[PDB]
Structures are given as structure tokens and as C-alpha cells.
Amino acid sequence: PPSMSITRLFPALLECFGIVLCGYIAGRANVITSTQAKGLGNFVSRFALPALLFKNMVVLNFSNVDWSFLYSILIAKASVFFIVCVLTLLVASPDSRFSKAGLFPIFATQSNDFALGYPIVEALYQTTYPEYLQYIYLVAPISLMMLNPIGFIFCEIQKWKDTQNASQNKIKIVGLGLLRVLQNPIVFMVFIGIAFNFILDRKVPVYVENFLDGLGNSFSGSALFYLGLTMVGKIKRLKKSAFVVLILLITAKLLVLPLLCREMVELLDKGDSVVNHTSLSNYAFLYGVFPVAPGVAIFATQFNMEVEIITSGMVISTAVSAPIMYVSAWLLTFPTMDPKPLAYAIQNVSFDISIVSLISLIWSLAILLLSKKYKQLPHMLTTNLLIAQSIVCAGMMIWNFVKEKNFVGQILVFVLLYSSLYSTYLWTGLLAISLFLLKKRERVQIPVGIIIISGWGIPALLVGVLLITGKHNGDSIDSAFFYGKEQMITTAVTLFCSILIAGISLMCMNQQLTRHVLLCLLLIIGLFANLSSCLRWLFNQEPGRLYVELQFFCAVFNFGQGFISFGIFGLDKHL
Amino acid sequence: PPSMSITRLFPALLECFGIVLCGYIAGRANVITSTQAKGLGNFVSRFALPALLFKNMVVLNFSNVDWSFLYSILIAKASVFFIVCVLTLLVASPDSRFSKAGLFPIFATQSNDFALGYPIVEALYQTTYPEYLQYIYLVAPISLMMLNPIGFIFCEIQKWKDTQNASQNKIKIVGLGLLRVLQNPIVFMVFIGIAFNFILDRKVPVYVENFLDGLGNSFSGSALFYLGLTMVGKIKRLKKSAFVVLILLITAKLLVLPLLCREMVELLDKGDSVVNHTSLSNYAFLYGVFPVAPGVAIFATQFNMEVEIITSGMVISTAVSAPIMYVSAWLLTFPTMDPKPLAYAIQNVSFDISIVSLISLIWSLAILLLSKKYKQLPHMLTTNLLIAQSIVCAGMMIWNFVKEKNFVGQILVFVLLYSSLYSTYLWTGLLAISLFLLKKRERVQIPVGIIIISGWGIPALLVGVLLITGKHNGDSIDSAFFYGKEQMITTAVTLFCSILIAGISLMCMNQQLTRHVLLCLLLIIGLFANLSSCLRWLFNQEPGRLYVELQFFCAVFNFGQGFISFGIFGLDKHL
Ligand SMILES: CC(C)CCC[C@@H](C)[C@H]1CC[C@H]2[C@@H]3CC=C4C[C@@H](OC(=O)CCC(=O)O)CC[C@]4(C)[C@H]3CC[C@]12C
Ligand SMILES: CC(C)CCC[C@@H](C)[C@H]1CC[C@H]2[C@@H]3CC=C4C[C@@H](OC(=O)CCC(=O)O)CC[C@]4(C)[C@H]3CC[C@]12C
Ligand SMILES: CC(C)CCC[C@@H](C)[C@H]1CC[C@H]2[C@@H]3CC=C4C[C@@H](OC(=O)CCC(=O)O)CC[C@]4(C)[C@H]3CC[C@]12C
Ligand SMILES: CC(C)CCC[C@@H](C)[C@H]1CC[C@H]2[C@@H]3CC=C4C[C@@H](OC(=O)CCC(=O)O)CC[C@]4(C)[C@H]3CC[C@]12C
């Protein structure tokens, strides 16, 4: 069976993250100041969300719930909480380890289940498994009732020891922690909704149904937009200690939790048919990938606890969960697809990513060109990288129309697509070189002509060499296999040349500029994901679907890298 | 054919106005301050509304439109604009008549078409005539493009002549008026959406569709809530000149415009079937009764032109439009219903109104009791009026279950219902008496025992007299006819006694207190509507459906007057 309507996921990510991007663009532009944003937030959190919760809680058929699925997602969230909690207590300093162990486990476990989770689960499962949408309104509140009072208890313990008590009365610490979690609209409107579920026998009165529809339907768009507004100005410059803790907590949230969810569902929910069980453990995985809840950042800013790591981490967790949800959901869907419709689905993914990536790149390029920054170094060289990324995205669009049409168009469009693709790799190298030569070799002139010649000619030399030395693999749909093993060898050698050049240069540089360094680092990370995926493809001699999985991992960066350069330069507040 | 799903209207009014009531309660409570409210407003007006407009404009099948229906609603709005514009120029003083003639015609014609209009049209017509929903997104923007630059031109003419020019360049006056109307998201996103309708051949791209869904679906609840927030503190104390101009402009908006819309549709759209034409002129009427747009108040508060009358008038127009939409839509639907299902539909209306009215009265009574104000005069006597209205509402709920069941229950529930009903009339009189005796006869003691005896015993005497002197009209379902003509005689005589007492006393009083005086006036207005409806029922000797129309008009005030007491005392910021 299809298990997930996976083709509905990209439009649903573009809905949810495009509304988050609208809120961000609005707050950055000061269309809505931070003072004004609290009105949307108070509407969202105190009117729209509590109505959405009440509606769904009253309607819920509790005898239709897979309780072992709830227990296993809750045991996965509770064990990640316990892991991050115990580790934070053991690793952090005695002066703040209870503020850290309070909120770092809440961060690693409280998903944005209602605003991001629900629309994405509705997109994936409303047709194949409409019952999966019940578990958001169950898991998310029950996870608050378990885990948020434990983190609030740790925060009250910090204040109790900071005020130099040997102990306070423990009942007031546990009582205020519990009372603070009961005061959250999420918890008490779930309690009220569970009560009215029984009082009404699940029939929402016709009078109240449309009132709850109007408030409930308003939550999704307004909460994503409020989330975007709350991201403005939250990525503080962090020390390396704060930055490594942030990477570890975003890892706990977006990698360890979804792996533990998938495992806990497979170990604890053993009472179902293999199709349901596989779909349900796949659902458990993408439940773990939902980003940190803005409620943790709202708590951190109001308590003034760990504000830098938690507000920055909530923003980076939000943004990073979008590609991880996409990549993860497709990886989990791939086992259901036959190799031929799978190949077309991966090309359709690449067309989708390259359409939206090309639009974001055209905006970013226009911004770089109109700001007239494109005449400086490093900006000329970042503008050449964005042009290479734009010819890559347009090339994938043209390829999806040409893919099996005719040999003349295929060869020219492959030359365009792969020369511009190798060019994006070599431009990550050459841009990182120019940052090394600008920061360190100030006296020495940078050869702009030789750099523009190398960034465009060496890719075209590599593509010419490949058309000469390779055999046409015309039995293949995928551009990432149109010249066979020697194309993955050429791709991998180009990635290794670029990661050498860019690693050498950003190292020697450490031995405007912050945006370009950050771009080169994020692109280097992407090139290392592509290199490791391409080397792993080249080393696997035994046949498998693993080939088309690794081609999908490569394609996501090849065509999606326009979003890294849009994120850094399309949204640069300096232009 | 049914023409309107009229039973879906009351839940839709409760959705729309309950979300307006939530926004009001939130702003009054300072859950969302006026500074914070601008964030919800900027989301609503600059993100959610323009996405809703673009979505529906791109989807619209323009060859499916009845252009004569559009022309006639626009000619009805343009003629109300012309009437109010010319009258305001002729009646007002030279120092401000161009500011008044700018915004008073915009007020009298710019409906709240997107936030209140659309969900109410959807509830009435989505099943019977889904094409009727196109015309909100057509009429509202085109009405802005015609009429809003003319009112902006009159405001620029005020500034141009107040700055003592003989005249300015007329092209800059017309050009700034038109440029200001083009800057409205409504106008330019309709232009952009019409263009993309043709560019895309109406197919919203799958990528953009769910993005426009998430923003567009969020507008409905957020705009009603923002409307509620913007109502807080806007009913300024007005002079009589301002108050009469406000009554006249609310009359132009909510009575003259829907009458002219209905007439213009019948005179100008002659090319259709009788069933279509009747439903389309009924739709034209309910289009005109939508309240004033919050965009006129937003303009007035930013320009500082006519703020008192426009912002107060927009709030009162909002509140007054709900009962007018309900009464009008049912009056227009009554010609489609056979007398027996019509009778049951009218009693179901009465049950609906009395359920929600009883809940609002239980809140208002609890507020008066817990504030302990109920021990003062006039508050004891307003509390007795609220108890009478609560027994009227409970009595209608009990009656709808008992209505044709058994004689014993019918006679007791009729005694309870009609004695408490006559008691609400006599308590409007006795309350207005106690205001006269408090303001004027300060030295004289008010006989609280005799007043409570008269307010409950005289109604029970009247009900006893009616059970003695009349005959059981057991062939009738309606409580308002269960004891025949002598019940409407008793009801009308009780109304005439109450309206005498209350008119005499509020007059002699003019020869806390302002809330109670206002309650007596609003209830006196409704008792006069009931008296005139009951006298008109008693005078009509020729048979007709007019009887059950007039019984519906009586019943709406009988069971809905609990909302006047909720509006004054349930929402009193002093408690
Ligand atoms: C590429 C495929 C696999 C999935 C689709 C990914 C999108 C959902 C991504 C691509 C670009 C991303 C955006 C690019 C840039 C930004 C700015 C970014 O700003 C900050 O982090 C700075 C916060 C501050 O101002 O302090 C917030 C995330 C956001 C909106 C990103 C949200 C997620 C987006 C839309
Ligand atoms: C190849 C595809 C899968 C890429 C999809 C985009 C993502 C990799 C997301 C996740 C993390 C995001 C980044 C997280 C943080 C930032 C910092 C932000 O810059 C600042 O906060 C600096 C200060 C300021 O701009 O005010 C600019 C966007 C950027 C790079 C984001 C852009 C979009 C990124 C790269
Ligand atoms: C019963 C049938 C005929 C239909 C009407 C039912 C509701 C839709 C009505 C009944 C009570 C009304 C509410 C009663 C009281 C108020 C407070 C009122 O407050 C103000 O006018 C004061 C503004 C200020 O603070 O200055 C605003 C309208 C509102 C929400 C009203 C909106 C329309 C409501 C919900
Ligand atoms: C009769 C039934 C079927 C419908 C019930 C609701 C309506 C009659 C509406 C139309 C006019 C509305 C009133 C218009 C003006 C006011 C004054 C307003 O005064 C204040 O807000 C100013 C003082 C303050 O409280 O700060 C309070 C709400 C009230 C009574 C409104 C309550 C709801 C009313 C009565």
C-alpha cells in the first residue's frame, strides 16, 4: 500500500515553512514589531490553539486509539528527556546545571506538534491513515503533562539553591512546577476537552462546532506566522561552548528522538499487522523530526533561563527540521515503490526542489545584483556561485522535460546541468579560497579573471572529459547516472577537490565576511554529505535500492543548495 | 427549492460574532493591548486577507459570473454613496463637510464582506447555490475601486481647501486618491489575482495552493478576532448631533442599502429564472446588511477624520448587523416553507436563541450576584429583570420539548413561560420607574417589596386571567398563540402598560445609572417592536403567513432580550 501520500509533503512543507518565512520577512521588515507580535501570539496560544485542542479532544474516539503507539512515543520522549537531563546534570557546572537540566530536556523533546506537526501529518496521512492525526492531540499534551513539570521543577530547584536554602519545602517546588504546567492552555484545554468528550458523547454541539472551527482553523497559519515573527533576531553570536551544546540539542531533537521513537514503536507496539506496523513506525520517526516548540523559547525568555541556546536552537531546529522531514519521509516511503515509479518520483522531487530553489535563487541573485554588492570581492564570487546554482536548478527543470525525449537535447542539457553542478562545487572551493586570500593576503591581489575562468572552465573541462571517456548510460532516467559509474567518479573527484580546497582555505583563514564564511561552511557540509553519499554509491557492488536512495541524497543537495544561498543572501538584512 | 440552508445561519452567526466577542473580551481584559492588537491586524490585513483574495481570484470562473447581479449590487452601493454623499454635502457645516462627505458615504457602503460576509454567505448558500460565494470577492474589491477613491478625493479636497488654496492641481488630488486606493491590499491583490487567473488558466499551482490555503483559512477567525479587539473603547460618549448622524448612517448601511440592493437586482438583472431571481434578490438583501468594514475605522483613526462617529458607528453597525442578518434571512426564507414545517422552524429558532440567551444570562446573573451589586437600587431591579429573562429562556427550552406532548405540562410550562415573559415587560417598566425615583425622588424611599411584588405578581395575575377568560388553542404549536387572540391581546396590553410606564419614567427622568438607562431604552425599543408586531397581528383579519412572521418578530425579542442584558451587564467592565 502507498502508506504516505508523499507527493503531498513538499506542498505541505512549502505551506508551513512559507508561512514561517512570511512571518520572518514581516518581522525583519518591521511590518510587525516585536511588541505587536505578542498580539498574534496571544491570539494563537490563548484563543486559536485552545479551541483547536478542545475541538479535536471532544471529537476523539478514545477506543479507536493505539495506546501502545502513544506509550512508545511518550517513552521515547521520556527517555530522551532522561538522557539529556542526566547528561546535562553530569556535564554542566554547579552554578547553572538545574536551569540547563530544566530546559535542555524540554528542548530535546517538546516538538512543535500543533503548528508544524499537524499540517505535515495531515498531508502525509489524512488519506492513507486518517487516524494518525489523533495522536498529535494525544502525544503532544500528554508529553507536556509528563515532562514540562519535571523541567519546571529543575528550574525552581535552581532558584531554591541560588537563594542559598539547604532545601525549600519539596511540596511547594513540585506543586508550583505542576501548577505552572496545568496553567498552560495546552494541558487544561485537553483536560476540559477530555471531560466534554465524555459529557457530550463526542457530539460537538452545532452551535459550538462552527465557533471552534473558526478559532481552530485560524491556528495553523497564525501560529506558523507567529513562529516566523519570533525567529527575528534570535540567532545571537554564540561561543563555541554554546554552539556545540546547540548542535548536540538539535541532534537530540531531530536525530536521536526520531530514531528512539521508531525503535520504541517497534519494541513496544507489537500487536498489529506488518503493513500497519511499518507505517506506524515510519510515522513515529517523522513525529520525532518536528522542530522544538516555540513554548520553550517563550518560557526561556520569560524565566530568563538559557535564552541564547534555547531561542537560537528553536530557530535552527525549525529550519533544519524542514529538510530532515523531507529527506526522512522520502527515505521511509522508498521501500514501498517499485524501481521505475521510484525513479520518476525522485526526478519529480528534483523538479519540485529545483522549481522553488530557482525562484529563491532568482530573488537572491536579483538582490545581490541590485544592491550592487556583486562588484566587490567576495560578493562577485558568491554571485557566480548563485549563477551556477541557478543554471543547476533551471537545468533540472529542463532535464525533467527532456529526460527520455531525445539524445541531442539530453546531451546539451546534461552538459548544462552537470557543468553548472560541478561549477557549484568548485565555486564553494574558490569562494572559500577568496575568503582566505581576503582575510590573510590583503596585500596580494586576487586574480578575478583566473578565478572566474577556473570556476566555469574547470567544470566544463570535467564535463567534456566525461562525454569523451564515458559510455552513454541512456537506459537511465536519472541525470545523476546518465554517464554511469564514471559520472559518479567525476562527481566524487570534483567534490573531493572542492572539499580539499574549501577545508584547506577555511582552516588557513581561521589561522559580509561572516555570511560568506557561513555559506562556505554550510555548502562544505553539503558537499561532504554528497561526497560520502557518492563514495558509498561507488563502493556498493551488491545491487539494491540503496543506489536510488543515495542518488536522492545527492539530488537534494544538488538542487536544494539554492536554499542555503537564499537563506544567507536572499534574506540578508543588509540588502 | 430550499434556496438558503437557513438552519446553518445561527451557528454561523455564533461563530462569527462569538469570535468577535472573544476578541472584545480579550481586549477589554487586556489579554491583548491595543499596541499588541496591531500585530494581529497587520497579519490579517497584509498576509491572511491578500492570500485569501489571490486564492479566490485565481480560482474564479469569470464566464460563470452573473454580471448583472454584480452591476446591480455595485449600482446599489454607488447610489447609497451618491445619496449619503450629496446629503452630507448639503446638511453639514463648511468647515468639515468634505471630510464628512468623504467618509460617511464610504461608511454607508463598505460592508465587512470578507470577515463577516463570507462565512455567513457560505453558511446560507454553499450547498444550495455555491456560486453566490464568488460575488463577495467580486463586489467588495470593485466597490472599493469605485467608491473608496471618491471618498479619499473628498478628504484631499478638505486638506487642499483648509490650507487656503483657491484650488490645487486636480490631477494630484485625483491621483493621490486613486494611488491610496490602489495601495489597499484588497485592490492590488485582486488585480494581481485576476492577472494570474488568466496566466494560470485558473489552476493554482500545487506548490502555492496549500500556502494560500494556510494563509487564507487563517483570515476568517483572525479578522473577526481583530475586529473584536478594535471595538474596545470605541463607543465614545457622543453628543446628540453625533448620535443622530450615527443612527442615520447605520440606517443607510443596514436598512436602505439592503433595500436598494434587492430593488436594483430586481430592476437590473431581468435575465433569469424565477427561483434563481428570487434567491438572488434575497442574497442581494443579505449582502447589504453586512456591517461597516473595519478599514473605514482604520482610515478614520489614522487620518484623524470623523473618528468618533465612524469608529463608534462601525462597532454599533457590527453588533446591530447580527440580529438584522438573522431576522432578514429568516423573513426572506419564510416564503419557501409550508406552514407546518415553518411553525416547527420558528420554534427551533426560538429554542436556539433561548439556549444561547440563557447561557449569556446565567453569566450575566452570576456576574451581578458575585459582584454583590445586586443589593443596590437600581441593581436589584435589573437582577429581577435578568431572572425573568432567564425563566423565559428556560421556559422556551422546556416548551420546545413539551410543545405537543401533554396538556398538564403544557399548561404549567405556558404559565411559567408567559408569566416570566410578561414579567420581563413589566420589569422594563418598573426598572425605568426606579431610575426616575432614584434620580429625581432621592428623599423618597423606593418600595422594594411593592416593586418586586408588582414585577412578579402582576404578570402571574395576567397569566391567571388569561387561563380563566380564554380557551386552550391546543391546535397551535406556538407558545405565542397557545391561548389564541386573547393571549396576543394580553401580551399587547402588557406591552402597552410597560411602554407607557417606561416612556413616562425615562421622560420624567430626563426632566451604574447610564448602563441601566441604556438597558431600559434598548428594551423599550424592542418592546415597541413587539407591541407594533402584536397590534399588527391583532388588526390583520385576512389570513396569511404574516401571522407567523409577526410571531417570529415577537419571539426574537422575547427570547433574544437576554443578549441586551448580556451586552450591558455581562460585559460591564466595572464587574
Ligand atoms: C530543500 C528541501 C529538502 C525542503 C524544503 C526546505 C524549505 C522548507 C527551507 C528552504 C529555505 C528555508 C528558509 C531559509 C532562511 C530562513 C531564515 C532563517 O533566519 C534565521 O535563522 C535567523 C534568525 C534571526 O533573524 O536571528 C530562519 C529560517 C528560514 C525562514 C528557512 C525556513 C525553511 C526553508 C523555507
Ligand atoms: C540543500 C537544502 C536541503 C538546504 C535547505 C536549507 C537548510 C539547510 C536550512 C537549515 C539551517 C538553515 C540556516 C540556519 C541559520 C541561519 C543564519 C541566518 O543568519 C543570521 O542569523 C545572521 C544574522 C542576521 O542575519 O541578522 C541566515 C540563514 C541561515 C544560514 C539558515 C538558512 C537555511 C538553512 C541553511
Ligand atoms: C439572537 C439573534 C437575533 C442573533 C444575534 C446573536 C449574536 C450574534 C449577538 C447577540 C449578542 C451580541 C453581542 C453583545 C455584546 C457585544 C459587546 C459590544 O461592545 C461594544 O459595542 C462596546 C465597545 C467599547 O468597548 O467601546 C460589541 C458587540 C457584541 C460583541 C455583540 C455582537 C453580536 C452578538 C454576539
Ligand atoms: C435583541 C436581540 C435579538 C439582539 C441582541 C443584540 C443587539 C440588540 C445589539 C445591537 C446594539 C448593541 C449595543 C450597542 C451599544 C452598546 C453600548 C456599549 O457601551 C460601552 O461599551 C460603553 C461603556 C463601557 O462599557 O466602557 C455596551 C454594549 C451595547 C449595549 C451593545 C450590546 C449589543 C446590542 C444591544
Side-chain angles (χ1 to χ4, degrees), chain A residues 11 14-15 18-19 22 26 31-32 35-36 38-40 42-43 47 206-207 210-211 214-215 218 221-222 225 351-352, chain B residues 11 14-15 18-19 22 26 31-32 35-36 38-40 42-43 46-47 206-207 210-211 214 218 221 225 351-352:
Chain A
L14 294 178
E15 169 187 9
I19 296 163
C22 288
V31 175
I32 294 160
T35 317
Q36 297 179 352
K38 290 186 180 182
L40 188 61
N42 286 8
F43 172 65
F47 295 87
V206 195
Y207 315 118
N210 288 160
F211 170 71
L215 287 185
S218 79
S222 60
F225 194 98
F351 178 93
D352 297 337
Chain B
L14 294 177
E15 168 186 13
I19 295 167
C22 287
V31 175
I32 294 160
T35 317
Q36 297 179 352
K38 292 185 180 182
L40 188 61
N42 285 8
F43 173 63
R46 307 186 184 277
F47 294 89
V206 195
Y207 315 118
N210 285 161
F211 170 70
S218 78
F225 193 98
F351 178 93
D352 297 337

Side-chain angles (χ1 to χ4, degrees), chain A residues 171-240:
Chain A
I171 295 173
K172 194 177 178 182
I173 283 175
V174 175
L176 180 56
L178 286 171
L179 180 59
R180 194 182 307 284
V181 97
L182 284 155
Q183 283 165 350
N184 190 325
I186 295 159
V187 171
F188 76 77
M189 276 278 156
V190 165
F191 280 135
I192 296 288
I194 288 161
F196 268 89
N197 186 298
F198 304 138
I199 290 169
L200 305 171
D201 281 323
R202 289 174 51 243
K203 300 173 179 183
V204 187
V206 195
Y207 315 118
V208 167
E209 180 173 46
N210 288 160
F211 170 71
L212 294 177
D213 292 326
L215 287 185
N217 290 2
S218 79
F219 173 76
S220 179
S222 60
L224 293 164
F225 194 98
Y226 180 58
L227 170 62
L229 288 169
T230 62
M231 312 201 305
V232 183
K234 299 310 183 189
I235 297 179
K236 279 72 177 75
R237 194 182 65 90
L238 297 184
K239 300 180 178 181
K240 284 178 181 177

